[PDB]
Amino acid sequence: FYEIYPKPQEISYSGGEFQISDEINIVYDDGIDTYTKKRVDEVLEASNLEATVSNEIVPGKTNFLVGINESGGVVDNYFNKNIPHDESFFDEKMDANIVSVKDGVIGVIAEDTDSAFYGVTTLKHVFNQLEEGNEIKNFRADDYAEVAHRGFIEGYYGNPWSNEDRAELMKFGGDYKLNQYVFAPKDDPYHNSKWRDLYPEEKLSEIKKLAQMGNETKNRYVYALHPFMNNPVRFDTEENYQNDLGVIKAKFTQLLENDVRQFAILADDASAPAQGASMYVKLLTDLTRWLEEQQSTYPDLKTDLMFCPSDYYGNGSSAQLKELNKAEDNVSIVMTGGRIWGEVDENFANNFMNNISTEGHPGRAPFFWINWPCSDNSKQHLIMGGNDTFLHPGVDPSKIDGIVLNPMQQAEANKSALFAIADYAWNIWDNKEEADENWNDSFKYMDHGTAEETNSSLALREISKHMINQNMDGRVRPLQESVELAPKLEALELIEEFTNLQKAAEYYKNNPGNERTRDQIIYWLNCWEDTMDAAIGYLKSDEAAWANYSEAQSAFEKSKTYGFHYVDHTEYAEVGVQHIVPFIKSMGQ
Ligand SMILES: [Ca+2]
Ligand SMILES: [Ca+2]
Ligand SMILES: [Ca+2]
């Protein structure tokens, strides 16, 4: 059995297997975009396979078929004839795709080219687990997403991700079927304090590169505009309004011309228009009409519109939310789970749907903005877990419109959490066990992007077990770290425990699967050595009970010396805040 993330909705292996031939025949249907074809080329190339595109199934070699349901193409036809399914499948499930591997034929059929890309991405992961010279097991996956909108947002308080960081995060998410990177960096004025202003050319070309990466990975770049805080859209006259709408179209047109294909509207921390929240709906509908018109020129453009209201922390009862709920179905209402540090929670979600509803307007499910693994209230820490705290196992997916994570300023460190959201949002975790398994596997993928366990992934997981707690008050549920060590803490066994951690941090520092990652978390890896020295000494503790005590004191102090820039000051890395650091102090005296 292959390890596949996110977990396929359904997968069965009828026995049997086959060797994939050195030369591959590829068939495509009309509608398969260049990005899907490119991914296919990349997948075969990396397996050292040679491929030719044709318009027919070629007997006596492995066939690779990627197609669209109801396209009337060869692939569409083959699946009808050979791979039994119900047509209603593609209507009733989102991002619906079937992956079929049987006796020489490798096929994907999807409702659209995006979901075709998802199916091919499943095969990418399968091709990284091939045995005995490209031997692949017969299987069928009938797959679909339970949450339509899945990804992450640069919306924290901290240093922006670098342009390279952003590309890297979209690449990562692009391997796990995420479909949104929401661009909202606070240091870009063009999205807020200069929202009316067009980008100059050199900045525009950087956006272009982000949008492009977004399209190539399907981890689509979403440009978020806030036109309500600073010289806002005017609703005092029709004249003013039409002018202002026109400024938005001008902003969006420039971005459309530079490969941007999805938008979002922010409205937090600002007054509503004169007359209140009903005017948002007016604006969103008009924008939607425009976007629809833009699809003639730009067919891949999404009309889905996320709207961040000024009471995202609310329960859905407010008058503003009720008004917004009267918007059309392409509008999503962003909430943080009933308080700032809220969670993907069935109770919250169901109440929100009851509370926001009005006569003639049933309450839509909330679109969650989750402040996890967000560390802007925990700046010294990495938050390397918390899966099931923030992404509750068992939540009825009809109560979730979307999920995007608000992560850490250190771009690379967020990969474990991206891997959580990707799996969960695609296939709701059944239970805590599934959440924990995801967490466990995440480090393999974070470290080197495959199901293979390496020493580096082992070591990264090991230190991460102790870097989870946020050391915050009760505004957020506390995340539990050092779960196995903490009982033991409540001596020579303990030296084993601590030297084991010291070696894992050292090993990871010296031999990371990903050098970008290691460089970004170097502060914590160095902090670990000193932290482990501090504790180790004390545990050793007549001449030697002084010495191993006094070594420790010095190490602990050195452990607080590893600083990185945080916006306008320096922060110092800290590891094992929950149990390890207190224990060093408890032993201290
Ligand atoms: Ca069909
Ligand atoms: Ca569908
Ligand atoms: Ca032992």
Going from the Cα of 504 to the center of ligand 3, the distance in angstroms, rounded, reads 17
DSSP line for 70-137: TS-SHHHHHHHHHS---THHHHHSEEEEEEEEETTEEEEEESSHHHHHHHHHHHHHHGGG-BTTTEEE
Going from the Cα of 93 to the center of ligand 2, the distance in angstroms, rounded, reads 5
Going from the Cα of 466 to the center of ligand 3, the distance in angstroms, rounded, reads 20
The Cα angle at residue 582 between residues 576 and 586, in degrees rounded to 5:
145
The whole-angstrom distance between residue 301's C-alpha and the CA centroid of its chain comes to 21
- Find the ligand nearest to 89 CA: 2
Which distant-in-sequence residues (6+ apart) come within 8 Å of 223 by Cβ? 183, 191, 207, 252, 255, 260, 262, 263, 264
Distances (CA, A) of 166 to 153, 429, 431: 10, 27, 31
Candidates 445, 584, 552, 567; CA nearest to 128 is 445
Which amino acid, one-letter code, is at 381? H
Candidates 482, 509, 518, 513; CA nearest to 498 is 482
Q: What's the 3-state SS for 359-420?
A: CCECCCCCEEEECCCCCCCCCCCCCCCCHHHHECCCCCHHHCCEEEECCCCCHHHHHHHHHH
Q: What is the C-alpha to C-alpha distance for residues 6 and 427, in angstroms, rounded to an integer?
A: 7
Are 320 and 342 within 8 A, CB to CB? no
Residues with CB in 5 Å of ion ligand 1: 69, 80
Collapsing DSSP states into helix, strand and coil, what is residue 216? helix
- Find the ligand nearest to 71 CA: 1
Taking residue 98's Cβ as centre, other Cβ atoms within 10 Å add up to 22
List the catalytic residue out of 30, 91, 269, 430: 269
- Is 202 assigned a ligand-binding role in the annotation? no
Are 155 and 406 within 8 A, CB to CB? yes
Which distant-in-sequence residues (6+ apart) come within 8 Å of 172 by Cβ? 415, 418, 449
- Is 80 assigned a ligand-binding role in the annotation? yes
The sign of the dihedral angle between the CA atoms of 475, 481, 485, 489 is negative
Which distant-in-sequence residues (6+ apart) come within 8 Å of 397 by Cβ? 146, 147, 428
- Is 92 assigned a ligand-binding role in the annotation? no
Tokens in use for 249? 């179209």
What crossing angle do the helices spanning 113-126 and 34-46 adopt, rounded to 10°?
10
Candidates 368, 454, 416, 415; CA nearest to 150 is 368
Q: What is the C-alpha to C-alpha distance for residues 244 and 194, in angstroms, rounded to an integer?
A: 13
The sign of the dihedral angle between the CA atoms of 317, 323, 325, 326 is positive
- Find the ligand nearest to 494 CA: 3
Collapsing DSSP states into helix, strand and coil, what is residue 358? strand
Are 537 and 551 within 8 A, CB to CB? yes
Taking residue 249's Cβ as centre, other Cβ atoms within 10 Å add up to 16
Going from the Cα of 500 to the center of ligand 3, the distance in angstroms, rounded, reads 11
Enumerate the domain spans of the chain: 1-144, 146-478, 479-589
- Is 329 assigned a ligand-binding role in the annotation? yes
Taking residue 515's Cβ as centre, other Cβ atoms within 10 Å add up to 10
Which amino acid, one-letter code, is at 314? G
Classify each residue of 284-298 as buried b or exposed e, where b means 16 or more C-beta atoms within 10 Å of its C-beta: bbebbebbeebeeee
Q: What is the C-alpha to C-alpha distance for residues 344 and 44, in angstroms, rounded to an integer?
A: 38
Query: Residue 391: what are its φ and ψ, rounded to 5°?
Result: -120, 85
Going from the Cα of 485 to the center of ligand 3, the distance in angstroms, rounded, reads 14
Which amino acid, one-letter code, is at 321? L
Tokens in use for 575? 């590891």
Half-sphere exposure of 287 (CA within 13 A, CB side): 34
- Determine whether 269 is an active site residue: yes
Q: What is the C-alpha to C-alpha distance for residues 89 and 85, in angstroms, rounded to an integer?
A: 8
- Is 496 assigned a ligand-binding role in the annotation? yes
Distances (CA, A) of 413 to 91, 93, 374, 479, 541: 37, 33, 11, 17, 35
Are 588 and 551 within 8 A, CB to CB? no
Q: What's the 3-state SS for 223-258?
A: EEECCCCCCCCCCCCHHHHHHHHHHHHHHHHHHHCC
Half-sphere exposure of 289 (CA within 13 A, CB side): 7
Q: What is the C-alpha to C-alpha distance for residues 119 and 63, in angstroms, rounded to an integer?
A: 16
Are 304 and 263 within 8 A, CB to CB? no
Taking residue 321's Cβ as centre, other Cβ atoms within 10 Å add up to 22
Going from the Cα of 76 to the center of ligand 1, the distance in angstroms, rounded, reads 6
Q: What is the C-alpha to C-alpha distance for residues 545 and 36, in angstroms, rounded to an integer?
A: 65
- Is 388 assigned a ligand-binding role in the annotation? no
The angstrom resolution of this structure is: 2.2
